Symmetry: D4
Subunit: 217 residues, 8 copies
């Protein structure tokens, strides 16, 4: 009975609730707009019209029952701030809030929100990376310098071996996976071929990988 | 270098432009809202007030020249749609568009957008995984079943060795990295220690990692 | 049981439904504005308030029953586009859509509308023809060059014969009908008189007719 | 040549002005919306921003000089009405006005408009005929009962001769034209062939043509 | 059973109905605004919310029963015009309409309104007369030259006689009434005194009276 | 001559200014609406854009100089009230204000307006008298009971003599004027004829005139 | 049964009613906005939605029962004025009204409001005093010159005696109270210590106190 | 001298600025509304149009220099909040903010405002005391129980001596001042007379003063 309540059904909030529901958790959907509540009614355990800045409505939902509450209101700063503050004063263990700008972040930080999230901003960065470097499909940064990257293989690697493309010595990186025709190879061994348009998961330093990307592929 | 046009300086569009500019690419920042143009003036090569649905304004920007055009308008479907169409007829190589819902996705597809992105939806899914599992700090899905996961170490893992935690045989998963106090250990050998509250990077099957999480940590 | 549904009750949509009803077909009238639905309630088999961009409402009407659906929404491009797309995905055989401008035409074309109609634009042309040439009551173009025209006869034709006004040799046109005092003569024979203010239906080349209009009448 | 003023650059008004200009007549394009004036600047002799209900602006345009004035305002009854009245008192020869509904028609009639047009309504009727009868591509009504119709030929008509299809005796109707692959056959002789998917132009009584359609094609 | 219906409850319309009711006539109060209908509910025989431009509502009131209908809508020209036209077509014997400007007068005149009234304009004149000439309390014009005026008497007439102030010979006017301390004297005889601040009713030529006003009072 | 300020160029205010200007008095026309200032520019000595509630603007107009100030604002109570107060504190001799309702009258009274006018209300009463009695063209009430009335002559009065119609004895009323075909007969002698459709001017008691109307005409 | 009614529930009005209720008086809460009425429903004897400018609603509340009525509407001048006037005419003994500016004060004064209050303006002054003089916690003016002030004691008074800080001779002021650690001493005697950060209540001339504030503390 | 910035020229903010300026301190008057800047131009050292939430505008005002900044925005929570935060990060010594409700208070507290004021609420309490007790003209609370009160003398107190009214023993309270006809008697001796309608200033316990009021006056 770990209960989640998602306040604000926007694209971000909507997705969290829709997803949490798919996982088979208990989720309460909360939105001031009636139509939204109708929309996500299928995708939550309970859907309720509520003005989340209004304390008595908030109490009527039985919000003190929830371990996690998500304020997925990032356009209306005042609604967002007021709801978060209410939840803090109502002693909610985890208050996760969508933030709009650096300033909205600060107030939320100050009023005691447990996690502040910038979904647009973060993906903006991620896509910009993929934009400049048309080779990066996906990735994850380990630290400021070290990073795991998923790469779409060019024709300058078609049918080449792991040992052929020596990266652990030649480029200081390690290869972790190949994905060919949907089939997946993990921690692939020294003799393994890589074909054009496969998925390649290289791990190392950011600059090291980009080096490899230059002369390698 | 590479020429990029970012039409619509939202929170998502704005990040792309800000980030790409930090990478030092030629970025044209376009918005109909004057104050947005004024806001991102420091973070672009050229920031211009334009109505991106108005064709003559689009030629006045000289958009035909650009390799990549990003429509970061995702609230106003009509603006988004109408612009993408304009850019298509104008023979732009790569048109990447921010989408709002499944149907706005569909029209973009049908008018031939090159890449459609749902930043909020995708991020929603990500955070939702992090919500039901407090241990996962981050992750990347290699495929429907296989995934590389970043985990926050608990007390059950303090002073534990890689050989002690036999993931490679017991769980079919492999550890890739350990982050201790900001210091970073890549593709670490079996003698190495994991201290609590550190970043642990495991790789394997989804159901297999969850298995490790349960009995392991 | 060929069923027609007319979505959007404007002047154009309204007329289609009002007319189709007069013919004794089955017609469903659909408009988001309640008053419109009340208006055309007499002139349809069934009149229903619906927001046609909303799929569940659209399904509740039982729209999959209709062989022909007409989206007579030309001011609101976004409502028009979204409805058409919905209907395409719901596998409607014939989707006829009112278009507003060249661009709205294109998107509709791309999303797979079966016939795009520009009722204002077309009549604008037709009347402009009648405007310059005060003699043309009505007409129909056969091709870019050839055209059937209905003409109001001047005093320079009063009581003249078919043979007198020889057009098949002298002007390369053929006369098809005279309409005098409401009485109608078809394929009128060589001796037939034509009186002032009668209706004359000439068939030929566009330039040929205008020639006739100059020296003839 | 002839002087025309088109007040109200709608989709209907706009077409008149665009078309008349292609014919090379002197067309004054008037609208209260600046952006409309800007849009049709290429398609007129003089395009002016004016409030057509304001009398002094109407003298500043010098409208008394024009032979033909077209009020293409059909949404805003008050603007339409008030303007027509202004033009009447200003002794304009021909005032043609776009009408919205039967009552807006009535006032225009009563304030002495010279020609009232319902472009959407009329076109609605036309398309509706085409809807119930997929064969009719176009048509012109000579009177309440007699009409010239353009038909799309089916398989039942392929390789058929004009003498084979005796319309002149069997159905009281006469064929006027055949269009094959863009090529055009006018007032064709009895030996001529009709191939499927061609344009066929028949003339007669309405009920008679429908009769031919039924058993013939 | 002479029935009156007052459509439009403004200051002017409201007063007509309120007054007609006081006289003990049958009056129907009609206004689109519900509150107005509530207001005049006491002051009419029947008060009904109706949109007077809507024919079926108009028919539901049973408007064809009324000998006199008053359209007391002078701000909204379009509502006024449309209602009047409706009433004309519904064959109402007397249609009295409040007009706003010279143009609104003309259309009403043309569509066949039986009496057009300019309540503001008329009183504006009347008060302006009283303004310049602080002596004129009230008056009524007989023709362009001849006029009956009510006058407040100065100290230069206090205790003077009818014969003393000879106006029928000296000024070509005739005196008709004196009103002293509320008591009224009619066709007052040659010996009658007039005191300061009495009411004096002089009849004659406009210029004649003003002459009297100069040297007399 | 005399200085007048007309604040608020309504239909009522506008008439005062237009009329007073025709009389050739110095009239200052003030309105907050620019287009009103532009409209009455021809009909005043000085027409100025001003917010009459703003004190400094009121000194910039130099209103202290004027003998008469007319507040012809009767829809906007707050504007009306606030202005009148401003003018009072500014020691203006005569403040005449247009009032909307009984309570707006009351405040004006209490803030010391010199004359309060209800043009619509008063005119409403007048026309209402004319409605129930088609014979009364015009009138003036001398007091609660005594009144001078202008009557439209019927068939019952055609070719009738003043001596024949003994009003002075039979009805206690006196005839004052006869208007025949525009020609005017003042204080007419007993031999004089009244022809039908002429203006008749009777004087007496209200109930007495109605009495004459009934049996007389 | 001294009844109070608070019309207008703003911050000021709300506080009056909330407070009067705490005291255990009978209070009627009145606001046009429904939500406000719901808000103060707990904090009044009776809470009622009413438009206070509407007389019949006002009468339905039974407003003639109240000894005191408070019009706590200071933003909307017209609503405030109209309500006050209504209450005057309904013969309410005490009409206390919140005023917005000097002008709104005047009209209220003129229409006979019993007390006019400027809550913002007054506190603005009070705080500005505390602002310049960081030593003044609170105070009360006796007249234009004489004033009782509460003062926060500096380190230049820590552990000093009443006789030590002789003010009745040295500065012409008298000390009335010390407040130390919450404990209160009144009319404190000559030997009494004063510690840093205590509360000191000095009484005298305004200039006298400020003198003391300079060399004393 | 001391530098003060008053952001938001409300009725409360406006008074602070007007008063502080009368005291002759350097006051910067900031508002987003141009007309407010224009209004208080006479009552400040520098009056500037600025959006106080916009950071660059805040540096353009040079706000870092000021010792005291007052946020007198209390309707617009978001503006208020966002500004206070800006000023905090900009290291301003004293930030005094006007608050609207308990929750707007809370955020200000949490973002570290130095003093939060509720001018309406506080004043509401004050007047409410004056309402239930017509005798109290003014007062100051020394603590929860002890208070100095200004009283309006009744008939029961006329010609009464300080010794006659033994408050110091009978009621535990002490009289501090008597105001007679504007003349002022400070810390008055026992022989002194109180005449009716004078200001009386008593000091003691709250319940004790009420006791005196009951039996005394
Ligand atoms: N006080 C409130 N109580 C409950 N729901 C609210 C409240 N205020 C806003 N919402 C809802 O929460 C959602 C928040 O999304 P919003 O419109 O603020 O933009 P956004 O967060 O940038 O959108 P997205 O989540 O797609 O990025 C909306 O559906 C809105 O109706
Ligand atoms: N026709 C247009 N031409 C240029 N810019 C436009 C046009 N229409 C919208 N924009 C801009 O594009 C941006 C798109 O953001 P929008 O407000 O539409 O919602 P959103 O994309 O969901 O927001 P976010 O990116 O923050 O999630 C806005 O900054 C807007 O000013
Ligand atoms: N989503 C919707 N669902 C159903 N009906 C709609 C929807 N959107 C608009 N309509 C209706 O369809 C009609 C469409 O006409 P619209 O106002 O778009 O201008 P128009 O098509 O140019 O007018 P006309 O048909 O006279 O040329 C309107 O009556 C409108 O109320
Ligand atoms: N007083 C006026 N003076 C000049 N132009 C005007 C005036 N009023 C309206 N217009 C213009 O006339 C045009 C009339 O089109 P409108 O938007 O009224 O509906 P419509 O005529 O039904 O549209 P459509 O012609 O596309 O069917 C508009 O472009 C409008 O800007
Ligand atoms: N279509 C309609 N049907 C019925 N009543 C209407 C309609 N349109 C307007 N009214 C009402 O009739 C009244 C007409 O007054 P309006 O607001 O037009 O200004 P006005 O005539 O200048 O005012 P006044 O009569 O005081 O001079 C209003 O009360 C309005 O609510
Ligand atoms: N503060 C102001 N200063 C100057 N002029 C104003 C102000 N407020 C209103 N006006 C003008 O005064 C006129 C008053 O007419 P309003 O529209 O208020 O209704 P009304 O007096 O009932 O109309 P009417 O006189 O036609 O019956 C308007 O022309 C308006 O522009
Ligand atoms: N006619 C009316 N009848 C009853 N209540 C009203 C009326 N008009 C306004 N109110 C209410 O009274 C209150 C008055 O506050 P208002 O919004 O006028 O600003 P304010 O008085 O400056 O606010 P505050 O009292 O906080 O200083 C509001 O809650 C409003 O809803
Ligand atoms: N971002 C901003 N920058 C500068 N000034 C602002 C800003 N936002 C609001 N203001 C101004 O601050 C003032 C604050 O008053 P507001 O109207 O918000 O209500 P209030 O403070 O309750 O009013 P009052 O002080 O009269 O009780 C207004 O004059 C407003 O124009």
């Amino acid at each position: 009975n770990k209960q989640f309540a998602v306040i604000g059904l926007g694209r971000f909030g909507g997705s969290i609730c829709k997803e949490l529901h798919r996982m088979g958790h208990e989720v309460l959907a909360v939105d001031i707009n009636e139509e939204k509540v109708n929309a996500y009614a299928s995708y939550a355990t309970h859907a309720v019209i509520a003005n989340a800045t209004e304390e008595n409505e908030l109490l009527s939902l039985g919000i003190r029952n929830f371990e996690y509450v998500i304020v997925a209101i990032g356009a209306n700063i005042q609604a967002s701030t007021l709801t978060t503050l209410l939840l803090k004063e109502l002693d909610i263990p985890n208050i996760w809030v969508k933030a709009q700008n650096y300033y909205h972040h600060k107030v939320l930080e100050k009023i005691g929100a447990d996690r502040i999230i910038h979904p647009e901003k973060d993906m903006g960065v991620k896509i910009a990376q993929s934009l400049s470097d048309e080779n990066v499909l996906n990735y994850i940064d380990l630290s400021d310098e070290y990073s795991i990257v998923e790469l779409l293989a060019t024709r300058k690697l078609d049918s080449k071996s792991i040992i052929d493309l020596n990266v652990r010595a030649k480029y200081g990186c390690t290869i972790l996976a190949i994905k060919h025709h949907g089939d997946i190879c993990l921690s692939p061994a020294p003799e393994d071929i890589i074909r054009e348009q496969d998925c390649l998961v290289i791990m190392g330093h950011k600059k090291d990988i980009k080096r490899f990307e230059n002369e390698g592929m």
